[PDB]
Design a protein around this ligand. Sequence first.
Ligand SMILES: NS(=O)(=O)c1c(F)c(F)c(S(=O)(=O)CCO)c(NC2CCCCCCC2)c1F
Length: 258
Amino acid sequence: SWGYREHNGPIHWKEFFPIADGDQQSPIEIKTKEVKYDSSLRPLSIKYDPSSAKIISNSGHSFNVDFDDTENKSVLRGGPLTGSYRLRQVHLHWGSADDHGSEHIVDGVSYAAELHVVHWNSDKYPSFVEAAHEPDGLAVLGVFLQIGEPNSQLQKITDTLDSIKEKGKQTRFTNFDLLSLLPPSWDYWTYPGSLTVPPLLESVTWIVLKQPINISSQQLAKFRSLLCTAEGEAAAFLVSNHRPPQPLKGRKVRASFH
Ligand SMILES: NS(=O)(=O)c1c(F)c(F)c(S(=O)(=O)CCO)c(NC2CCCCCCC2)c1F
Protein backbone atom coordinates (compact mmCIF):
# COMPACT_ATOMS: atom_id res chain seq x y z
CA SER A 1 0.00 0.00 0.00
CA TRP A 2 1.06 3.52 -0.85
CA GLY A 3 3.23 5.73 1.35
CA TYR A 4 6.42 7.67 1.36
CA ARG A 5 8.97 4.91 1.97
CA GLU A 6 11.51 3.63 -0.55
CA HIS A 7 9.33 0.88 -2.06
CA ASN A 8 5.87 2.56 -1.75
CA GLY A 9 6.72 6.27 -2.17
CA PRO A 10 5.86 8.82 -4.89
CA ILE A 11 8.06 7.37 -7.66
CA HIS A 12 6.00 4.14 -7.40
CA TRP A 13 2.53 5.58 -7.23
CA LYS A 14 2.10 5.43 -11.07
CA GLU A 15 2.11 1.59 -10.65
CA PHE A 16 -1.29 1.58 -9.08
CA PHE A 17 -2.47 5.13 -10.02
CA PRO A 18 -1.33 5.96 -13.57
CA ILE A 19 -3.08 9.33 -13.39
CA ALA A 20 0.18 10.09 -11.44
CA ASP A 21 1.70 11.03 -14.86
CA GLY A 22 -1.40 13.01 -15.93
CA ASP A 23 -1.70 16.44 -17.31
CA GLN A 24 -3.18 18.18 -14.27
CA GLN A 25 -1.10 16.80 -11.40
CA SER A 26 -0.07 18.59 -8.25
CA PRO A 27 1.92 19.97 -6.62
CA ILE A 28 3.78 22.23 -9.09
CA GLU A 29 6.57 24.79 -9.34
CA ILE A 30 5.32 28.35 -9.60
CA LYS A 31 7.61 30.52 -11.82
CA THR A 32 6.36 34.05 -10.83
CA LYS A 33 7.87 35.70 -13.98
CA GLU A 34 5.36 33.73 -16.00
CA VAL A 35 2.27 34.23 -13.72
CA LYS A 36 -0.40 36.79 -14.81
CA TYR A 37 -2.47 38.89 -12.40
CA ASP A 38 -6.17 38.31 -13.16
CA SER A 39 -8.51 41.20 -12.16
CA SER A 40 -11.57 38.90 -12.66
CA LEU A 41 -10.82 36.96 -9.47
CA ARG A 42 -13.26 37.95 -6.71
CA PRO A 43 -12.31 38.70 -3.16
CA LEU A 44 -11.55 35.46 -1.22
CA SER A 45 -14.12 34.92 1.51
CA ILE A 46 -13.30 32.71 4.46
CA LYS A 47 -15.97 31.99 7.05
CA TYR A 48 -14.81 29.41 9.57
CA ASP A 49 -16.55 28.30 12.75
CA PRO A 50 -14.31 26.73 15.36
CA SER A 51 -17.14 24.44 16.46
CA SER A 52 -17.10 22.78 13.04
CA ALA A 53 -13.90 20.86 13.97
CA LYS A 54 -14.73 17.39 15.27
CA ILE A 55 -11.79 14.95 15.44
CA ILE A 56 -8.08 14.70 14.77
CA SER A 57 -6.66 11.39 13.59
CA ASN A 58 -3.50 9.81 12.31
CA SER A 59 -4.26 8.48 8.81
CA GLY A 60 -0.79 7.03 8.47
CA HIS A 61 0.09 9.73 5.92
CA SER A 62 -0.38 12.91 8.07
CA PHE A 63 -2.63 14.04 10.89
CA ASN A 64 -6.15 14.93 9.60
CA VAL A 65 -8.54 17.33 11.41
CA ASP A 66 -12.08 16.44 10.17
CA PHE A 67 -14.92 18.93 10.15
CA ASP A 68 -18.58 18.64 10.28
CA ASP A 69 -19.45 19.31 6.77
CA THR A 70 -23.27 18.76 6.58
CA GLU A 71 -23.59 22.42 7.41
CA ASN A 72 -22.41 25.69 5.68
CA LYS A 73 -20.97 27.15 8.98
CA SER A 74 -17.40 26.86 7.57
CA VAL A 75 -17.08 27.66 3.88
CA LEU A 76 -14.69 29.06 1.31
CA ARG A 77 -16.08 31.34 -1.38
CA GLY A 78 -14.78 33.92 -3.85
CA GLY A 79 -11.35 33.92 -5.41
CA PRO A 80 -11.47 31.66 -8.47
CA LEU A 81 -14.48 29.63 -7.15
CA THR A 82 -18.06 29.47 -8.36
CA GLY A 83 -20.39 28.69 -5.42
CA SER A 84 -19.72 27.56 -1.87
CA TYR A 85 -17.02 25.01 -1.01
CA ARG A 86 -17.55 23.41 2.37
CA LEU A 87 -14.60 22.88 4.69
CA ARG A 88 -13.82 19.12 5.07
CA GLN A 89 -10.36 18.65 6.52
CA VAL A 90 -6.97 20.05 7.35
CA HIS A 91 -3.57 18.17 7.16
CA LEU A 92 0.14 18.98 6.83
CA HIS A 93 3.12 17.94 4.69
CA TRP A 94 6.80 18.10 5.78
CA GLY A 95 10.17 16.65 4.92
CA SER A 96 12.88 14.77 6.92
CA ALA A 97 14.80 17.98 7.40
CA ASP A 98 13.77 21.63 7.86
CA ASP A 99 15.27 22.96 4.63
CA HIS A 100 12.56 21.43 2.36
CA GLY A 101 9.24 19.77 2.95
CA SER A 102 6.66 21.89 1.17
CA GLU A 103 4.84 20.39 -1.78
CA HIS A 104 4.60 23.58 -3.98
CA ILE A 105 7.91 25.33 -4.69
CA VAL A 106 8.06 29.05 -5.64
CA ASP A 107 10.88 30.22 -7.93
CA GLY A 108 12.94 27.29 -6.62
CA VAL A 109 12.18 28.12 -2.92
CA SER A 110 10.98 25.25 -0.68
CA TYR A 111 9.50 25.87 2.69
CA ALA A 112 9.76 23.59 5.74
CA ALA A 113 6.13 22.40 5.52
CA GLU A 114 2.79 23.09 3.81
CA LEU A 115 -0.68 23.03 5.38
CA HIS A 116 -3.64 22.05 3.20
CA VAL A 117 -7.28 23.05 3.90
CA VAL A 118 -9.60 20.84 1.80
CA HIS A 119 -13.09 22.01 0.78
CA TRP A 120 -15.68 20.52 -1.53
CA ASN A 121 -18.49 21.82 -3.82
CA SER A 122 -21.69 21.13 -1.81
CA ASP A 123 -23.64 23.49 -4.14
CA LYS A 124 -23.33 20.74 -6.87
CA TYR A 125 -22.32 17.42 -5.34
CA PRO A 126 -23.91 15.21 -2.65
CA SER A 127 -20.77 14.35 -0.71
CA PHE A 128 -17.02 15.00 -0.44
CA VAL A 129 -16.41 11.55 -1.85
CA GLU A 130 -18.46 12.28 -4.92
CA ALA A 131 -17.02 15.81 -5.42
CA ALA A 132 -13.47 14.34 -5.42
CA HIS A 133 -14.26 12.83 -8.84
CA GLU A 134 -15.31 15.98 -10.62
CA PRO A 135 -13.18 18.81 -12.07
CA ASP A 136 -14.80 21.56 -10.08
CA GLY A 137 -15.39 19.26 -7.10
CA LEU A 138 -12.58 20.32 -4.65
CA ALA A 139 -10.78 23.49 -3.56
CA VAL A 140 -7.62 23.28 -1.48
CA LEU A 141 -5.98 26.23 0.26
CA GLY A 142 -2.20 25.77 0.69
CA VAL A 143 -0.26 27.76 3.36
CA PHE A 144 3.53 27.51 3.54
CA LEU A 145 5.36 27.12 6.81
CA GLN A 146 8.82 28.66 7.16
CA ILE A 147 11.21 28.05 10.06
CA GLY A 148 10.87 30.96 12.45
CA GLU A 149 9.61 31.84 15.91
CA PRO A 150 7.32 29.17 17.39
CA ASN A 151 3.71 29.43 16.36
CA SER A 152 1.32 29.46 19.29
CA GLN A 153 -1.57 28.63 16.92
CA LEU A 154 -0.20 25.16 16.36
CA GLN A 155 -0.47 24.21 20.06
CA LYS A 156 -3.89 22.64 19.94
CA ILE A 157 -2.56 20.33 17.21
CA THR A 158 0.83 19.57 18.71
CA ASP A 159 -0.72 18.79 22.12
CA THR A 160 -2.62 15.91 20.56
CA LEU A 161 0.18 14.14 18.75
CA ASP A 162 1.19 11.68 21.48
CA SER A 163 -2.46 10.57 21.62
CA ILE A 164 -2.47 9.87 17.90
CA LYS A 165 0.97 8.39 17.53
CA GLU A 166 -0.10 5.18 15.78
CA LYS A 167 -1.97 4.99 12.49
CA GLY A 168 -5.76 4.80 13.04
CA LYS A 169 -5.78 6.60 16.42
CA GLN A 170 -8.24 9.45 16.86
CA THR A 171 -9.02 12.09 19.41
CA ARG A 172 -11.79 14.56 20.08
CA PHE A 173 -10.80 17.94 18.46
CA THR A 174 -13.18 20.83 18.55
CA ASN A 175 -13.14 24.59 19.07
CA PHE A 176 -10.28 24.83 16.69
CA ASP A 177 -9.23 28.30 15.46
CA LEU A 178 -8.22 27.56 11.85
CA LEU A 179 -8.59 31.12 10.72
CA SER A 180 -5.64 32.15 12.92
CA LEU A 181 -3.32 29.64 11.31
CA LEU A 182 -3.58 31.67 8.04
CA PRO A 183 -1.08 34.46 7.39
CA PRO A 184 -2.16 38.05 7.52
CA SER A 185 -2.08 38.48 3.77
CA TRP A 186 -4.26 36.18 1.61
CA ASP A 187 -2.70 37.01 -1.70
CA TYR A 188 -2.49 33.74 -3.71
CA TRP A 189 -1.75 31.83 -6.82
CA THR A 190 -4.35 29.51 -8.40
CA TYR A 191 -4.29 26.73 -10.95
CA PRO A 192 -6.17 23.46 -11.85
CA GLY A 193 -4.61 20.34 -10.37
CA SER A 194 -5.04 17.23 -8.29
CA LEU A 195 -4.93 15.53 -4.95
CA THR A 196 -1.22 15.13 -4.01
CA VAL A 197 -1.86 11.66 -2.58
CA PRO A 198 -3.33 8.56 -4.19
CA PRO A 199 -5.82 8.45 -5.79
CA LEU A 200 -4.34 11.62 -7.31
CA LEU A 201 -7.64 12.72 -8.79
CA GLU A 202 -7.71 15.79 -11.01
CA SER A 203 -10.50 17.55 -9.20
CA VAL A 204 -8.78 20.34 -7.33
CA THR A 205 -8.78 24.11 -7.72
CA TRP A 206 -5.56 25.00 -5.91
CA ILE A 207 -5.27 28.28 -4.03
CA VAL A 208 -1.75 28.62 -2.76
CA LEU A 209 -1.13 31.65 -0.44
CA LYS A 210 2.07 33.63 -1.09
CA GLN A 211 2.84 34.60 2.55
CA PRO A 212 4.21 31.83 4.80
CA ILE A 213 3.46 31.34 8.48
CA ASN A 214 6.11 30.33 10.97
CA ILE A 215 6.88 27.12 12.76
CA SER A 216 9.86 26.39 14.94
CA SER A 217 12.20 23.55 14.34
CA GLN A 218 11.19 21.90 17.66
CA GLN A 219 7.52 22.08 16.74
CA LEU A 220 8.07 20.66 13.30
CA ALA A 221 10.07 17.75 14.69
CA LYS A 222 7.09 16.57 16.76
CA PHE A 223 5.21 15.76 13.50
CA ARG A 224 7.98 13.43 12.40
CA SER A 225 7.42 11.12 15.47
CA LEU A 226 3.96 10.23 14.23
CA LEU A 227 4.00 6.66 12.93
CA CYS A 228 2.84 5.44 9.53
CA THR A 229 2.23 2.07 11.17
CA ALA A 230 -0.63 0.84 13.35
CA GLU A 231 -0.45 -0.37 16.98
CA GLY A 232 1.12 -3.87 17.39
CA GLU A 233 3.09 -3.50 14.21
CA ALA A 234 6.84 -2.84 13.80
CA ALA A 235 7.14 0.93 14.00
CA ALA A 236 8.08 3.14 11.08
CA PHE A 237 8.11 6.90 11.42
CA LEU A 238 6.34 9.42 9.21
CA VAL A 239 9.54 11.57 8.76
CA SER A 240 8.60 12.87 5.34
CA ASN A 241 5.24 13.03 3.57
CA HIS A 242 5.56 15.42 0.58
CA ARG A 243 5.19 14.64 -3.13
CA PRO A 244 7.59 16.42 -5.46
CA PRO A 245 6.24 18.97 -8.00
CA GLN A 246 4.95 17.57 -11.26
CA PRO A 247 5.19 19.32 -14.69
CA LEU A 248 2.70 22.02 -15.68
CA LYS A 249 2.17 20.44 -19.06
CA GLY A 250 0.60 23.59 -20.49
CA ARG A 251 -1.33 24.89 -17.55
CA LYS A 252 -0.98 28.48 -16.55
CA VAL A 253 -0.86 29.77 -12.98
CA ARG A 254 -2.88 32.99 -12.16
CA ALA A 255 -2.15 35.52 -9.41
CA SER A 256 -4.58 37.36 -7.18
CA PHE A 257 -2.24 40.33 -6.76
CA HIS A 258 -0.11 42.59 -9.06
N1 LIG B 1 -2.54 16.76 -0.16
S1 LIG B 1 -4.26 16.80 -0.72
O1 LIG B 1 -4.72 18.04 -0.36
O2 LIG B 1 -4.45 16.93 -2.10
C1 LIG B 1 -5.35 15.76 0.08
C2 LIG B 1 -6.67 15.92 -0.22
F1 LIG B 1 -6.99 16.94 -1.09
C3 LIG B 1 -7.55 15.05 0.32
F2 LIG B 1 -8.89 15.21 0.04
C4 LIG B 1 -7.07 14.12 1.19
S2 LIG B 1 -8.30 12.99 1.87
O3 LIG B 1 -7.29 12.40 2.87
O4 LIG B 1 -9.20 13.94 2.64
C5 LIG B 1 -9.22 11.78 0.94
C6 LIG B 1 -9.52 12.26 -0.46
O5 LIG B 1 -10.44 11.35 -0.97
C7 LIG B 1 -5.74 13.96 1.53
N2 LIG B 1 -5.18 13.00 2.43
C8 LIG B 1 -3.87 12.32 2.51
C9 LIG B 1 -2.79 12.90 3.41
C10 LIG B 1 -3.22 13.33 4.81
C11 LIG B 1 -3.78 12.20 5.72
C12 LIG B 1 -5.27 11.77 5.48
C13 LIG B 1 -5.80 11.42 4.11
C14 LIG B 1 -5.03 10.21 3.63
C15 LIG B 1 -4.02 10.74 2.64
C16 LIG B 1 -4.81 14.84 0.93
F3 LIG B 1 -3.49 14.76 1.19
